[PDB]
Design a protein around this ligand. Structure first.
Ligand SMILES: C[S@@+](CC[C@H](N)C(=O)[O-])C[C@H]1O[C@@H](n2cnc3c(N)ncnc32)[C@H](O)[C@@H]1O
Ligand code: MET
Ligand code: SF4
Ligand code: SF4
Ligand code: SF4
Lengths: 13, 439
């Protein structure tokens, strides 16, 4: 979830 | 220690409130009690706020809020209203946010004061880089003031080449004076000495340099210029002790070329090195897109391993919409989001982002630059009014996919079939799954 949160935070321009 | 610090963002939300530290962007979700308390602090000061909620403090409800390092002394004048009316407006505001079911205001504002650019990058998402109707900084100041008052988190100055914008210096000074966490992204070719000086001494503004590679041959192919100017300016900011970042678009760099950039960022103490997904969403890009989001993850793995194995330190990041689709192992139906995260993660155009073109056009995203629908004017209408009633926002916010696979996807609520702008291009947007999705 910490890993998922980092990826989701980066999922943007 | 009388009021909320300028380095902290506090906002009422439909679920209570949100707290964000502007130095690292870590969030804290608040209940109504905490939110209304801090709302009084914001408008009346700690003494009035604490007196009002004495019962709640007595019951231990506000222990966390009082303990947080978010307080300071400001020159801002308190509200002329009675604290009871302020609390009255708070309840009305929260109820309104519930009815509209939206975040209160965008966290990310992106302004394009001039679409003019001196370069013509083959990967540029803009259709044209000409502009003869750019507004003065004074007109943009009115925009920034609205953004600050309604709880924006950060402002990004783009274009176009913003350092070629005639009134850039005043615009930057305006951001500094309003204490808005700001970034400006530039090709660094003909940046003025006055502009560099303002940035070097700035507390609230961070420069980002657009640089694809140290390889002089390849960078010229991609940007039409050598890397010399970006390299030179990055060194300068280091020597004067100013934080500076670099952003590259992943077009056709090799791994060895990326690593060359990584090493450069390490030695010159770059504050952040980002590699962006090459986005075709606007439909104006020229260079062929070689790599996909799965390839972007592949690069992330390779670079992070290199940094670790070489025992180096660098704030490295890969960025792009729907990048999570390249992480299938992290996706499942047990994923549960908070009320805020569900509206924040995924497509930022829905509830967290606003972009304003040089002519005042308000877009939920730059992706709407290639959408043939009417856009409201920021120079003639309040941002907040548009944030509520705008049809483009309403369309992308209410869009729901009917795709079978997506309906069973764990990230359905934050994705809805992929990029909304891509989907509406297709014959049946609600059944089409965006091709960027690697799942
Ligand atoms: C989109 S903004 C913000 C980028 C990134 N989020 C950051 O932290 O700076 C500015 C960058 O967009 C890049 N850019 C231009 N055209 C692009 C495209 N078609 N796809 C992706 N990035 C692009 C420019 O090179 C510029 O460095
Ligand atoms: C569309 S790019 C906008 C910012 C600047 N022209 C750069 O490329 O760095
Ligand atoms: S420098 Fe920025 S605005 Fe100018 S062409 Fe390159 S990417 Fe586009
Ligand atoms: S496009 Fe569909 S399947 Fe792919 S991540 Fe989004 S919702 Fe899930
Ligand atoms: S509209 Fe498309 S490009 Fe813009 S933020 Fe949402 S997913 Fe990304």
């Amino acid at each position: 979830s910490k890993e998922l949160e980092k990826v989701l935070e980066s999922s943007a321009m | 220690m009388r009021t909320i610090s300028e380095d902290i963002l506090f906002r009422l939300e439909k679920f209570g409130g949100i707290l964000i530290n502007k130095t690292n962007f870590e969030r804290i979700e608040l209940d109504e009690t905490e939110a209304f308390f801090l709302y009084l602090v914001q408008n009346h000061g700690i003494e009035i706020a604490t007196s009002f909620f004495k019962k709640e403090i007595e019951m231990g409800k506000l222990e966390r809020a009082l303990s947080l390092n978010i307080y300071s002394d400001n020159n801002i004048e308190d509200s002329l209203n009675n604290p009871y009316e302020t609390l009255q407006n708070a309840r009305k505001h929260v109820a309104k946010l519930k009815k509209h079911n939206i975040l209160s205001f965008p966290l990310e504002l992106v302004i394009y004061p001039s679409m003019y650019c001196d370069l013509k990058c083959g990967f540029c998402f803009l259709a044209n880089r000409e502009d003869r109707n750019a507004k003065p900084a004074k007109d943009w100041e009115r925009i920034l003031r609205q953004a600050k008052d309604n709880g924006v988190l950060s402002v990004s100055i783009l274009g176009g080449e913003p350092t070629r914008y005639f009134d850039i210096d005043n615009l930057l000074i305006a951001c500094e004076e309003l204490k808005i966490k700001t970034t400006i992204t530039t090709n660094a070719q003909l940046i003025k000495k006055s502009t560099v000086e303002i940035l070097a001494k700035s507390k609230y503004i961070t420069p980002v340099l657009s640089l694809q590679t140290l390889d002089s041959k390849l960078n010229f192919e991609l940007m039409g210029v050598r890397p010399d100017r970006q390299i030179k300016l990055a060194k300068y900011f280091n020597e004067v002790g100013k934080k500076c970042r670099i952003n590259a678009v992943y077009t056709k760099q090799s791994y060895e070329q990326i690593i060359e950039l990584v090493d450069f960022c390490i030695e010159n103490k770059i504050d952040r090195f980002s590699v962006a997904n090459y986005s075709e969403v606007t439909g104006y890009t020229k260079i062929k897109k070689k790599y996909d989001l799965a390839d972007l993850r592949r690069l992330n793995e390779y670079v992070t391993d290199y940094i670790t194995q070489r025992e180096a330190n660098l704030n490295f990041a890969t960025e792009g919409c729907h990048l999570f689709t390249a992480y299938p192992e992290l996706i499942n139906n047990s994923i549960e989001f908070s009320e805020f995260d569900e509206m924040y993660y995924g497509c930022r155009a829905k509830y967290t982002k606003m972009e304003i073109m040089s002519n005042g056009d308000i877009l939920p995203c730059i992706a709407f630059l290639g959408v043939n629908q009417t856009k409201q004017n920021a120079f003639e209408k309040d941002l907040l009014d548009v944030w509520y009633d705008d049809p483009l926002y309403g369309g992308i916010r209410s869009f729901r996919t009917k795709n079978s696979k997506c309906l069973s996807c764990g990230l359905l609520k934050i994705c809805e079939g992929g990029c909304y702008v891509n989907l509406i291009k297709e014959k049946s947007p609600e059944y089409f799954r965006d091709s960027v999705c690697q799942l």
